[PDB]
Ligand binder design. Structure first.
Ligand SMILES: COc1cc(S(C)(=O)=O)ccc1Nc1nc2ccc(-c3ccc(NC(=O)[C@H](C)c4ccc(F)cc4)cc3)cn2n1
Length: 260
């Protein structure tokens, strides 16, 4: 099987992602270099949808200059029928990798944290708030994490999380949305990387779950662990009041990412 994009031919090794109307393929080009290609069929896309796509793409293409913790987009072709995006290929996404994993090296955890902070900080500096961060938004590429999307393109549905509520901040439920909202969600991802679950994972009922998330009389548990700085990061990211919640520039100066 094969594909053409801006005049260059790519052979398909396998499919590494799917969707109703979208696929991601691992591929090789004419020089035997490997890449990932996202394909989007526009057949049934309305104008608002289309504009959400073009906006996500414009941002990806822009923000590439600004951080190597954003996935590399080398090229794209777009027509009225489809989109093809040629990207660097990662090894696996963070969600899949977390599920495959029984314990995480503290050093590796701290290193991924920093990467996530950096990428999210970068989008905040261009006025983007993702507001739906989750492990699937991050990709392992050469033992670094890279953010792959900005929360702008309309989402859909045909390893998997989407419409999930476990990372949703309290003020997204009540609904205002600020950069602080993305801190909660990163906080939830860090908590999963620390304790093996998300902070409200055990509450099965979705409505009970949402109620617990906004209820300040519901205490979140932070079992003691040998890295006290990690435990303080979690406590600080997961304040329900956004005005109380630590900020990204603060988290980047925190002893958890700075010390040793
Ligand atoms: C072998 O590699 C693997 C394996 C396994 S797996 C199956 O092991 O779990 C898993 C992963 C990999 N690799 C991989 N490499 C890459 C590179 C890039 C992307 C990627 C990048 C950006 C997006 N962006 C969007 O979808 C956004 C929302 C968008 C943008 C424009 C639109 F028109 C519409 C939507 C989507 C996908 C994903 N992967 N995934």
């Amino acid at each position: 099987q094969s594909m053409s994009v801006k005049g260059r031919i790519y052979s398909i090794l396998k499919q590494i992602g799917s969707g109703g109307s979208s696929k991601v393929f691992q591929v090789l080009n004419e020089k035997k270099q490997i890449y990932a290609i996202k394909y989007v069929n526009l057949e049934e896309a309305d104008n608002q949808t289309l504009d959400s796509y073009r906006n996500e793409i414009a941002y990806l293409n822009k923000l590439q200059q600004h951080s190597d913790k954003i996935i590399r987009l080398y090229d794209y072709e777009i027509t009225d029928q489809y989109i093809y995006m040629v990207m660097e290929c990662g090894n696996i996404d963070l969600n899949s990798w977390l599920k495959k994993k029984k314990s995480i090296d503290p050093w590796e955890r701290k290193s991924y944290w920093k990467n996530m902070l950096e990428a999210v900080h970068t989008i905040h500096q261009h006025g983007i708030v993702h507001s739906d961060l989750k492990p699937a938004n991050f990709l392992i590429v050469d033992g670094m994490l890279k953010l792959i999307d900005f929360g702008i393109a309309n989402q859909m549905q045909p390893d998997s999380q989407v419409g999930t509520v476990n990372y949703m901040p309290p003020e997204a439920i009540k609904d205002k949305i600020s950069p602080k909202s993305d801190v909660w969600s990163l906080g939830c991802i860090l908590y999963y990387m620390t304790y093996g679950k998300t902070p409200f994972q055990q509450i099965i009922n979705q409505i009970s779950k949402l109620h617990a998330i906004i209820d300040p009389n519901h205490e979140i548990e932070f079992p003691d662990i040998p890295e006290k700085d990690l435990q303080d990061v979690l406590k600080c990211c997961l304040k329900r009041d956004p005005k109380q919640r630590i900020s990204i520039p603060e988290l980047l100066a925190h002893p958890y990412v700075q010390i040793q």
